[PDB]
Write an enzyme that holds these catalytic residues in place. Structure first.
Site, PDB file in Angstrom:
ATOM      1  N   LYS A 262       0.862  -1.177   0.000  1.00 47.44           N
ATOM      2  CA  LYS A 262       0.000   0.000   0.000  1.00 47.44           C
ATOM      3  C   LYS A 262       0.898   1.226   0.000  1.00 47.44           C
ATOM      4  CE  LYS A 262      -3.999  -1.915   2.473  1.00 47.44           C
ATOM      5  NZ  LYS A 262      -4.902  -1.694   3.638  1.00 47.44           N
TER       6      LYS A 262
ATOM      7  N   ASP B   3     -18.435   1.805   9.875  1.00 46.90           N
ATOM      8  CA  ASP B   3     -18.587   1.179   8.564  1.00 46.90           C
ATOM      9  C   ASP B   3     -18.344  -0.317   8.739  1.00 46.90           C
ATOM     10  OD1 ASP B   3     -19.123   0.899   5.932  1.00 46.90           O
ATOM     11  OD2 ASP B   3     -17.217   1.700   5.206  1.00 46.90           O
TER      12      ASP B   3
END
Lengths: 114, 104, 271, 37, 63
Positions: C111, C198
């Site tokens: 990432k 979430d």
RNA sequence: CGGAGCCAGCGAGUCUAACCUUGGCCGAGAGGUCUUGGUAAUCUUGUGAAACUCCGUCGUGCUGGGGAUAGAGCAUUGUAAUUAUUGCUCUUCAACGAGGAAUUCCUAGUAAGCGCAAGUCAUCAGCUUGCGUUGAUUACGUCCCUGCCCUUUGUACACACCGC
């Protein structure tokens, strides 16, 4: 059987009578025309069929015309169809009638992911 | 219209052509349940059998089920020509077949 | 070794001032002649690893996003990490996710963070460090989560996990224990002091080991949404987590709860 | 197919005039489609 | 099942001041299709009084 | 879904070729036959488009929503349709119960919904452009986010010391 017809009765049929037993695609293909050079290729094909020993497989004939309808004239020949790179030799069966020659020769390597 | 009321006499789930059919939908959309049979096919069959298709499938007598089955095994004899059937111009036989539900 | 060391030196010639002129990259390197410094800077600029800002009477050198990660690769050459680079699975907002491999040959996840002159780099650095510390906190508490390998100043290299999201998962056989799991895990979140608002279908990742032993786990990636219980709006955040689990299990798995689900007032007697 | 100056890039293939959008704006002041609005 | 669905229409429609398409399916005895047949039948009988008629919704009144 | 009513506009059309096609018969259709009109405000054309209006069937049920996938044949253009160019008929009826982190555009016939025409066009669009039909909500405020600039000038420590 192609339309419920015995095999040897199919074998001695002309092209036009096989069009009389054909689907719409084959009928409209032959109704527009055919090139003069596959006639000489069929003469070479039947000469190599006449170069066949008894009770064995005939001489394999290499082919580029992949779009040709397999007519019962060519049942039994060992044909090397060209896939764009190489020839693949298959015995023509009565199970192969009405088909293009391009349907029986894979033109590319498979794609392996998993 | 006229509310025509029936003292029972209807079955909840019928079975035809070895397949369960719900006897509460319209007869077109109750015979659409089985395989090889869609909307317009059951519609044209029951119009050749002259079946009232605004009637549900619980108010249907088994004699009309026999008529529908007779049109199943005889579509081309009852003025339903070759364009309407499943397997037209076969290679094995050269005939026109309507492949049924459990015979696939 | 040597060229990477001098590139580390001009990396260390960035934490001195603002936008760095030419002679500072000449002298911080401390190399022999005009050759090495100037041809290195030209190799940077032609590979877009550096840029020229000419503000009046003043040459200066502007580092873009390109000429950093090599040093991170050098920083990851130090820490036994990745050798081969590049397979795109997922271009996110605050990171770009790649599938990479080490010298050992195991595939990993790279990432890179892109959040110029100092602040893009430095905020990507703060984001990578913050996410690495949050991953460390989750693994230290014992949460089933991917194991971090390293956080190469602004690029996080971690493991790959064989999972697929729950939107393509029809059901399992042990549905009520899965509901008790996805209730008790949000209970464990409230017992940590946090609420992951979430908690959707795309978050929850299931690894699948076998079909007989049933020894599997979960992966929860909700990092810029975890909110402490002391904040203003955590009540219906917790309730949105619980009720998204319940409405998914009613819609997809067709499961309704027989025990009543936990409230925020239920979990106020937790941590 | 460009039959004027071998300029396939951006043919205007409409109506068979077949001029590329570079040379169409070269010869724009010979046909009459010009700037009004 | 004819004499223990049909006459409850004849009890409920004079009860209800407002009888329309989906305030008559709501009794949970009938389908939404035959309900309009019962509507036209009570038009013919006279317990249902026409207010306005559309092909998707029809407003009536008890007698 | 099944009938009925049938409302536009921008275009575009054939020569030393096969363009746009009206009409009549055949075919379930695809399509085919026979012609005719128009080099055009004339014929196609009043392009009787779609969305829309009304009446019946359905009755909330992955249903009569959906139409992905697949089978069978039949026709059309193309020399050549196979990895199906495409059109027609019947059948097979999948995920998908208003959608996350995040993202785009926008103030009146504008949005949105709708189709049509023209270029890509040998055959088809989910490609691009113009046209017309029906036609909202809500601002008419702000630099709070996003930025973009425009400037004002505290300044270069005019490069100083160091620990390192």
């Amino acid at each position: 059987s192609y339309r419920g017809v015995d095999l040897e009765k199919l074998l001695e049929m002309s092209t036009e009578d096989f069009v009389k037993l054909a689907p719409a695609r084959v009928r409209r293909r032959f109704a527009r025309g055919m090139t003069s050079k596959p006639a000489g290729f069929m003469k070479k094909l039947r000469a190599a069929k006449l170069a066949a020993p008894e009770n064995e497989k005939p001489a394999p004939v290499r082919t580029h015309m992949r779009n040709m309808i397999i007519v019962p004239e060519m049942i039994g020949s060992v044909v090397g169809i060209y896939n764009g790179k190489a020839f693949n030799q298959v015995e023509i069966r009565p199970e192969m009638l009405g088909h293009y020659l391009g349907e029986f020769s894979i033109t590319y390597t498979p794609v392996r992911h998993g | 219209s006229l509310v025509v009321q029936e003292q029972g006499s209807f079955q909840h789930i019928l079975r035809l052509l070895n397949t369960n059919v719900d006897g509460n939908i319209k007869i077109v959309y109750a015979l659409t349940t089985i395989k090889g049979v869609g909307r317009r096919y059951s519609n044209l069959v029951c119009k050749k059998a002259d079946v009232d298709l605004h009637k549900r499938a619980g108010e249907l007598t088994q004699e009309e089920l026999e008529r529908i089955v007779q049109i199943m095994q005889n579509p081309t004899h009852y003025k339903i020509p070759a364009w309407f059937l499943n397997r037209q111009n076969d290679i094995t036989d050269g005939k026109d077949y309507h492949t049924l539900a459990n015979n696939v | 070794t040597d060229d990477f060391r001098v590139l580390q030196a001009v990396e260390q010639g960035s934490r001195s001032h603002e936008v760095v002129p030419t002679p500072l990259i000449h002298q911080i390197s401390g190399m022999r002649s005009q050759s090495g410094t100037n041809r290195a800077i030209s190799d940077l600029a032609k590979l877009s690893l550096i840029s020229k800002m000419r503000n009046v009477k003043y040459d200066g050198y502007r580092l873009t996003y390109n000429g950093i990660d090599y040093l991170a690769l050098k920083t990851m050459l130090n820490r036994d990490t990745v050798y081969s680079v590049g397979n795109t699975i997922g271009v996110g907002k605050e990171s770009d996710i790649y599938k990479v491999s080490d010298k050992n040959g195991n595939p990993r996840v790279m990432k890179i963070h892109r959040l110029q002159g100092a602040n893009w780099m430095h905020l990507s650095r703060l984001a990578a460090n913050k996410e690495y510390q949050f991953m460390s906190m989750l693994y230290s508490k014992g949460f089933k989560v991917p194991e971090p390998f390293d956080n190469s100043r602004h690029i996080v290299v971690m493991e790959l996990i064989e999972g697929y999201p729950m939107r393509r998962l029809r059901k399992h056989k042990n549905i009520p224990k899965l509901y008790s799991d996805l209730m008790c895990f949000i209970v464990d979140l409230a017992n940590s002091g946090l609420i992951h608002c979430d908690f959707n279908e795309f978050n929850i990742m299931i690894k699948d080991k076998l079909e007989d032993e049933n020894d599997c786990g979960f992966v929860v990636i909700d990092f810029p949404q975890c909110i402490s219980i002391q904040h203003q709006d955590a009540d219906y955040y917790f309730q949105r987590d619980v009720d998204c689990i319940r409405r998914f299990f009613k819609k997809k798995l067709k499961y309704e709860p027989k025990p009543d689900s936990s409230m925020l007032d239920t979990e106020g007697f937790g941590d | 197919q460009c039959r004027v100056c071998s300029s396939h890039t951006g043919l205007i293939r409409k109506y068979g005039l077949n001029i590329c959008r570079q040379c169409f704006r070269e010869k724009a002041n010979d046909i009459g489609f010009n700037k009004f609005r | 099942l004819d004499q223990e669905k049909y006459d409850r229409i004849l009890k409920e429609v004079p009860t209800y001041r407002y009888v329309s398409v989906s305030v008559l399916v709501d009794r949970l005895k009938i389908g939404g299709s035959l309900a309009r047949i019962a509507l036209r039948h009570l038009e013919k009988e006279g317990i249902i009084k026409p207010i306005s008629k559309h092909s998707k919704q029809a407003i009536y009144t008890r007698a």
